Amino acid sequence: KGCSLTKAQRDSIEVCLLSICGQLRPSMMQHLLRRLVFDVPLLNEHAKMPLKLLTNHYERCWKYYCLPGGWGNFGAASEEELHLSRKLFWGIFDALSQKKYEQELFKLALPCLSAVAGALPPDYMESNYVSMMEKQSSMDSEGNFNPQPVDTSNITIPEKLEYFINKYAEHSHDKWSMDKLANGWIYGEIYSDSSKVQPLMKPYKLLSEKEKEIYRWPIKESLKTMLAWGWRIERTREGDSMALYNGYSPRAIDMSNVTLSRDLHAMAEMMAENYHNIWAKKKKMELESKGGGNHPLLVPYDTLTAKEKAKDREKAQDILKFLQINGYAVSRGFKDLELDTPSIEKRFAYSFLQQLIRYVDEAHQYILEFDGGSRGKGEHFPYEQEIKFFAKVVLPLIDQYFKNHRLYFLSAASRPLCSGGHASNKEKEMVTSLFCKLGVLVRHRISLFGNDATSIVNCLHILGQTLDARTVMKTGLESVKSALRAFLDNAAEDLEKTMENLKQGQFTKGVTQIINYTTVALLPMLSSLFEHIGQHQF
Amino acid sequence: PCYEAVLPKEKLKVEHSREYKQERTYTRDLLGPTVSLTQAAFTPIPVDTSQIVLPPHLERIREKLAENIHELWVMNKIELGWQYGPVRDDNKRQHPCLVEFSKLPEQERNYNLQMSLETLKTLLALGCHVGISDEHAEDKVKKMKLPKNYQLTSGYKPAPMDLSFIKLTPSQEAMVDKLAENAHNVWARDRIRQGWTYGIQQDVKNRRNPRLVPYTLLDDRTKKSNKDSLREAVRTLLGYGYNLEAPDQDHAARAEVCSGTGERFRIFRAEKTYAVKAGRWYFEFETVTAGDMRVGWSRPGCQPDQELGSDERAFAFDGFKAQRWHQGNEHYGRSWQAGDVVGCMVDMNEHTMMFTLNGEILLDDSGSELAFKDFDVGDGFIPVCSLGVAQVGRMNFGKDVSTLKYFTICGLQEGYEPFAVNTNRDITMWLSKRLPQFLQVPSNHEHIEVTRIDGTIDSSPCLKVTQKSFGSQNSNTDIMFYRLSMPIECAEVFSKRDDYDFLMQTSTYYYSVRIFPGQEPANVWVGWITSDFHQYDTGFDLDRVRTVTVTLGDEKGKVHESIKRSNCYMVCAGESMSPGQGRNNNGLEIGCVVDAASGLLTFIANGKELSTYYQVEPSTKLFPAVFAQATSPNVFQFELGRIKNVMPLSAGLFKSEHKNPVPQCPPRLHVQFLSHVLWSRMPNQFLKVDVSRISERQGWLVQCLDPLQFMSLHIPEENRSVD
Numbered sequence A: 001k002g003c004s005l006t007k008a009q010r011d012s013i014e015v016c017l018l019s020i021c022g023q024l025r026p027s028m029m030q031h032l033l034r035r036l037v038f039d040v041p042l043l044n045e046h047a048k049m050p051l052k053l054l055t056n057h058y059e060r061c062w063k064y065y066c067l068p069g070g071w072g073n074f075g076a077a078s079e080e081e082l083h084l085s086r087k088l089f090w091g092i093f094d095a096l097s098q099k100k101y102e103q104e105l106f107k108l109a110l111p112c113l114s115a116v117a118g119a120l121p122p123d124y125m126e127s128n129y130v131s132m133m134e135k136q137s138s139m140d141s142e143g144n145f146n147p148q149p150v151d152t153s154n155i156t157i158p159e160k161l162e163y164f165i166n167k168y169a170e171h172s173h174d175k176w177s178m179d180k181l182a183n184g185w186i187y188g189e190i191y192s193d194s195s196k197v198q199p200l201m202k203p204y205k206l207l208s209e210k211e212k213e214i215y216r217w218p219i220k221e222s223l224k225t226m227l228a229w230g231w232r233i234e235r236t237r238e239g240d241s242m243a244l245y246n247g248y249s250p251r252a253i254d255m256s257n258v259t260l261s262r263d264l265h266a267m268a269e270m271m272a273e274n275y276h277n278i279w280a281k282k283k284k285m286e287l288e289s290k291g292g293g294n295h296p297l298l299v300p301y302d303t304l305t306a307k308e309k310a311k312d313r314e315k316a317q318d319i320l321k322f323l324q325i326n327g328y329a330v331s332r333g334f335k336d337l338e339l340d341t342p343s344i345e346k347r348f349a350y351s352f353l354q355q356l357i358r359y360v361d362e363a364h365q366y367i368l369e370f371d372g373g374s375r376g377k378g379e380h381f382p383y384e385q386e387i388k389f390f391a392k393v394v395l396p397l398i399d400q401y402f403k404n405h406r407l408y409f410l411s412a413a414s415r416p417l418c419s420g421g422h423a424s425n426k427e428k429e430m431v432t433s434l435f436c437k438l439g440v441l442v443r444h445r446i447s448l449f450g451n452d453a454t455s456i457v458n459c460l461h462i463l464g465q466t467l468d469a470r471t472v473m474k475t476g477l478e479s480v481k482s483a484l485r486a487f488l489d490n491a492a493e494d495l496e497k498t499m500e501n502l503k504q505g506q507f508t509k510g511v512t513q514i515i516n517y518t519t520v521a522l523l524p525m526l527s528s529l530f531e532h533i534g535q536h537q538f
Numbered sequence B: 001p002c003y004e005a006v007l008p009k010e011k012l013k014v015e016h017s018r019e020y021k022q023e024r025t026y027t028r029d030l031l032g033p034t035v036s037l038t039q040a041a042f043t044p045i046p047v048d049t050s051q052i053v054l055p056p057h058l059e060r061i062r063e064k065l066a067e068n069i070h071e072l073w074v075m076n077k078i079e080l081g082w083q084y085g086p087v088r089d090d091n092k093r094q095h096p097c098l099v100e101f102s103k104l105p106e107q108e109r110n111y112n113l114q115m116s117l118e119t120l121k122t123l124l125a126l127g128c129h130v131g132i133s134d135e136h137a138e139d140k141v142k143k144m145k146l147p148k149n150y151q152l153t154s155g156y157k158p159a160p161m162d163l164s165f166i167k168l169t170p171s172q173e174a175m176v177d178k179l180a181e182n183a184h185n186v187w188a189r190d191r192i193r194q195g196w197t198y199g200i201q202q203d204v205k206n207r208r209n210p211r212l213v214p215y216t217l218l219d220d221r222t223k224k225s226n227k228d229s230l231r232e233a234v235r236t237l238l239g240y241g242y243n244l245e246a247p248d249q250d251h252a253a254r255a256e257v258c259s260g261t262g263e264r265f266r267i268f269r270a271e272k273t274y275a276v277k278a279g280r281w282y283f284e285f286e287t288v289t290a291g292d293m294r295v296g297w298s299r300p301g302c303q304p305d306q307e308l309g310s311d312e313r314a315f316a317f318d319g320f321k322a323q324r325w326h327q328g329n330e331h332y333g334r335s336w337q338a339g340d341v342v343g344c345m346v347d348m349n350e351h352t353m354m355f356t357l358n359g360e361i362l363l364d365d366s367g368s369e370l371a372f373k374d375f376d377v378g379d380g381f382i383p384v385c386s387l388g389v390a391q392v393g394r395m396n397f398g399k400d401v402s403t404l405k406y407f408t409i410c411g412l413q414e415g416y417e418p419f420a421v422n423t424n425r426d427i428t429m430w431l432s433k434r435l436p437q438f439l440q441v442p443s444n445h446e447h448i449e450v451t452r453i454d455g456t457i458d459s460s461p462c463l464k465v466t467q468k469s470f471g472s473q474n475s476n477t478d479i480m481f482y483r484l485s486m487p488i489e490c491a492e493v494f495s496k497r498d499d500y501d502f503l504m505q506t507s508t509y510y511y512s513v514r515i516f517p518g519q520e521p522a523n524v525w526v527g528w529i530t531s532d533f534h535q536y537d538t539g540f541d542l543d544r545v546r547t548v549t550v551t552l553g554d555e556k557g558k559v560h561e562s563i564k565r566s567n568c569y570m571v572c573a574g575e576s577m578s579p580g581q582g583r584n585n586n587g588l589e590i591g592c593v594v595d596a597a598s599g600l601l602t603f604i605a606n607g608k609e610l611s612t613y614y615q616v617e618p619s620t621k622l623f624p625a626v627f628a629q630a631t632s633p634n635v636f637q638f639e640l641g642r643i644k645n646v647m648p649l650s651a652g653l654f655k656s657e658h659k660n661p662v663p664q665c666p667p668r669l670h671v672q673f674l675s676h677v678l679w680s681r682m683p684n685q686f687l688k689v690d691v692s693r694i695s696e697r698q699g700w701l702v703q704c705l706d707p708l709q710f711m712s713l714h715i716p717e718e719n720r721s722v723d
């Protein structure tokens, strides 16, 4: 991202990052995916490297995303990177659409769109969870980092949490006091820092007022930190037990042998990055106090490394370790209300295919305007760049997407891909309808297409083998049935015209134009239709 | 009588308790893990419907429906020939149910009301919503006629909208199937409340009924009678315009995961002393059924617990997946069917291994005809086969050349030799042992690690069991079973400053267990076990310990004394410290004292004697054992110390140290853990027992008249016998 690099330097860093990322682990790079999905949609000059990087990753681990189980050694997608990749694909596709046509960027982004579309399963159920107040404000555009915390002081702490605070404050004084008793600070009324004597080795119930502020602050803001994200806490009964049975006596109770579950380790990780945020925010305030001297610790939490993280994360989860030692239990604050798997809208195939139909219907409106525009003086219409965006991305994107998902659109829960990969019958219906309306779009404009007519011909040709026409006749909407019959009538009139031209002269500028149009478009598409009908006995 | 418990369509036979009997080796039906016979106990489990609410169209229709449908059954009974009368006894060909609301019995009245309610309530509780097509469908009320003369004198015209005009979907048929079985389930809970139970012949006095069976197992005439009645009520429903949309058949496959015990697959292989160092060999496997089966060649180091083809030690091939298996899965070949025969040919010279299915030689994705390109000879290869749940197969090693089905057409001209071409004796079969056994903790074992801590002058000898794999990815959080090899022998005949004389004369022995801080004590169980303990479960509690109480009486029948048997005697550490501060300050200390002469198992914890105790029979093996579930890298510890006036455990274990008060931990004593991975050797010979029912007069006859005998090496310390 830095701008001081020369072109050669920017090329060398590109090769370095690509070479590392290729053999690099997807569990590693899912961390970089978060800042990728925020920068790539901007579609600036610096996005060229991320485009190919994402293309290569999504083609390297395509089975990991596609296969329901994935590789046994590698694993399967945990669906949060799937949601991120869905947002990423849709954002790139939309913003690419609004952006003006540049040939290099378009031909570099088409493989990326194809790779991400292939990686994403079309039946993917997006999680109803969305993220709040994420870390894009943490890697904000201004200064490239912002250590924003949450408003802790808003929250109030209940009475059982007060009682927690009392217990854990006693325990924190225990830890503090053994630590300096072992270090050499010993009890004594005189207060001398050099002499290693302090009166502060004395029982919590009698110690001075000083600790309650600087003991509660860690505790009370760590608790308001629960309540901002809202994680419900509970209590086990051993806690009521300690209270019932009931200068200070030094007794060493051990700390580390307690071990923690994976979700709660991630929990400690996120509350720890909250600690890093407040910590780095106050270092930043004292940095604009000093004027300068950008300290090396100001890299974000995710950029932050293991050794600098360890002394922080340990004190992060020590509070929860004592929480479920002393007899408290913390659970997840939020529960999803309902997740709808038989829903049709959540399927990626749904949104993808009807967004494609919206684009193609808009293109049909544009070709309705071009029915008089091509008759008019010039093509210069608000949609020249738009039909270019078709002619280079959308139909080739359909090509690549179908050659990635052949069997999904063919498996109607009907024996192939037993693990998964069923495409719904209504989705198949609307697939046949988009076939029909693409055929109506391509009919009698081959000369009007700028040498991309042959491209769309073979796109529809392979799409004519990805078609299935059993679903349409078992169950279909009347309009889709009428579209199929209209395509039959177009093929019928074309076949009648061919028999007629064979009727006067079969041996081989309007007639020349229509014969060239035939030999370019019709023959491959009649062959595809006829071979499909023959191989499926339709 | 025992014959009263047989299922209806099943025949009662006297069969072998175990799977394998005496027969010909190439016809030996190898059985994989079976499916759990859970459905044998018929517990009606229907869906609850009271929690949901029913829509206003249901409220104002459940009366008019109920009227039409109760008349709909009086129509069926009139068709059968029914006659109405004032009296209640239907045996007298008279019964008051045909008449209407005000003049039919009010209990049947409200019963019809509530059954209509629960019908259209379960219509929403079954996952299907229903909505009126239009208000016209309810407003229009046409009545087709039924003969009034053949109907009874009751003024109301019986026949509504007849049987026909609606249409059938397979969704509706599947709906009414389960609605009818749910009605039977409600009937079944009613008879259970009355106290009824299933019996071959119906007995009202004994509460015996043959019709208390699952829906798929009922009698056809009755199930179809209630079926036609029930969805003729559904005929009426669809007549009144209530349009329903079926829930989609929800893809949910159990994939035959549930199996007998915990075993999902059984591996069969030849004896390790038959591995071929070189040469060209032939071997066939016959598939009686089609299933998740794997046949190939295994190395002598193959582990029965690991699935075939996941490691380098196995070289297998899968049917349904069309999958050749070695250190992963890559596509090869075609899926088989029932009756298919697969012939495995191995060359040990050019390191090529091929398979033939039904006489034709398989192709992989590549052009290579052979399956596995090259490998190393190693220590040899032996035939091997894994069988999945409810799968049966036959191994034919070519003891007789003619028995091989496809050897002549393929494998003979190439010159591959049958695996048993030049053997006079039958090849011994080795298979996975279903019952887990206790064996020493291997050092290479990634999960369990045991450290022996030498006892100082001030420290008792200690054996620490810690999980080195814990704290990492792919670890298994399951309870492990631990024990010490040396047992404690109870006295043969029960008698009915430590004092040195008391220590010399006493027979009470003691050992301690330390529950390390951070380890959940409720996961840990401390106590004694016997040699019979062979139970491995994912979730263990004190309620699942197997016990029996033999009560012996006198001539008049009074039980003068009762004896309790149990393979396991332990307490639970989590309930062991009830007060607290028994774990956090210092690791929980549980002590077990055993009295050889008296036979009392007493547990001492932190200086407080726990109320639980066990009485043990004379002459009983007892092994110190700890059952723990991992929660920390450091789990628990075996202390060998002794409390005041109690003889240390080493004296009880070792007879040479019988009079040695100083605790000892000799190298012989070591920790063993329950492990599935072991091999069982099929006998070459079995007892020949013919079974047959002589007649109804005599009954089933079993007889054995030829003796068989085998040498049994008995391991003394383990109290176990091997062959």
Ligand SMILES: Nc1ncnc2c1ncn2[C@@H]1O[C@H](COP(=O)(O)OP(=O)(O)OP(=O)(O)O)[C@@H](O)[C@H]1O
Binding pocket: B097, B108, B111, B112, B187, B191, B196, B202, B209, B211
């Ligand atoms: N609401 C009713 N209206 C008319 N007759 C009824 C009604 N309820 C029950 N009966 C009669 O009582 C019988 C009870 O049948 P049910 O389904 O309870 O089982 P059963 O096999 O007859 O009884 P059991 O299990 O005690 O042998 C019915 O077959 C029918 O003859």
